[PDB]
Amino acid sequence: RHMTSNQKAILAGGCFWGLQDLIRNQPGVVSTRVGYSGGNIPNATYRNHGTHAEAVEIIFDPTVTDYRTLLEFFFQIHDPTTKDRQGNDRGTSYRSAIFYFDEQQKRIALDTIADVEASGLWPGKVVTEVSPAGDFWEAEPEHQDYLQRYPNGYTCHFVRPGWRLPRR
Numbered sequence: 001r002h003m004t005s006n007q008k009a010i011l012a013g014g015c016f017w018g019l020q021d022l023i024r025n026q027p028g029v030v031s032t033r034v035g036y037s038g039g040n041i042p043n044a045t046y047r048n049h050g051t052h053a054e055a056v057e058i059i060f061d062p063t064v065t066d067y068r069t070l071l072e073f074f075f076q077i078h079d080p081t082t083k084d085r086q087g088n089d090r091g092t093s094y095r096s097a098i099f100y101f102d103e104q105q106k107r108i109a110l111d112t113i114a115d116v117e118a119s120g121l122w123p124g125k126v127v128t129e130v131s132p133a134g135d136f137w138e139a140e141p142e143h144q145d146y147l148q149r150y151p152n153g154y155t156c157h158f159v160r161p162g163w164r165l166p167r168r
Contacts, residue, residue, distance in 0.1 A: 008057065008058065008059055008101055009058045009099075011055060011070075012055040012096060012129075013086060014054070014086025014096075014156065014157065015086065015094065017034070017143070017153060017154065017155060018077075018078075018156060018157030019157055021146075022158075023077075024148075028069075029065065031058075032056055032059070034055070035057060036052035036053070036136075037055040037057075037136045038055065038129070038134070042135065042137075052093070052137065072164075072165060076159055076161075077157050079122075080122065080126045080128045081123050086157075095129065098128060099131055099134070109130045110130060113126050113130070115165050121162060121164070121165075
C-alpha cells in the first residue's frame with residue numbers, strides 16, 4: 001500500500017526458541033512468531049511437521065532496519081554451515097533456510113551468502129537453503145515467546161561477534 005509498508009521474512013536456523021528470542025529484540029523488528037515452514041504437509045504441529053523447518057516469521061519496518069541487516073544478524077546467531085543440524089539439534093527440522101517472498105529478497109539472500117563465503121570468517125561452506133516462501137504453520141502457544149517466558153530454558157543460539165561483514 002505504500003513504499004515503506006512493513007516487510008516480512010521467514011528464516012530457519014535451528015531450535016526456534018533461540019532464533020525468536022534473539023531476533024525479536026533487533027532494531028526495526030515489529031513482530032515475530034514461530035512455526036513450521038518449507039515442508040510438505042498442511043496443518044503442521046510440533047509432533048507432526050514432516051519436512052518443514054522450525055522457522056521464525058519476522059515483520060519489520062524498512063525505514064528502521066532492512067532485509068540485508070536482518071540476514072546479517074541471522075548469519076551471526078546460528079551456524080549456517082551444518083546440514084540439517086544446529087548445535088546438538090539434529091534433523092531437517094533444524095536446517096538453515098531463507099524463505100523469500102519476492103525476487104529482491106532472493107537476490108539479497110544470495111548476495112549476502114556470497115559475502116559471507118568470501119569473508120572466510122564462518123567455519124565452512126554456507127549450506128543455507130534459499131527457497132520461495134510458502135505456507136507458514138504457526139506453532140502451538142507453548143512454543144511462542146518461549147525464552148521470554150522461561151529465560152533459563154534451552155538454547156544454543158548466541159551472537160558470534162566475529163561473524164560480521166565490515167563492508168558489503
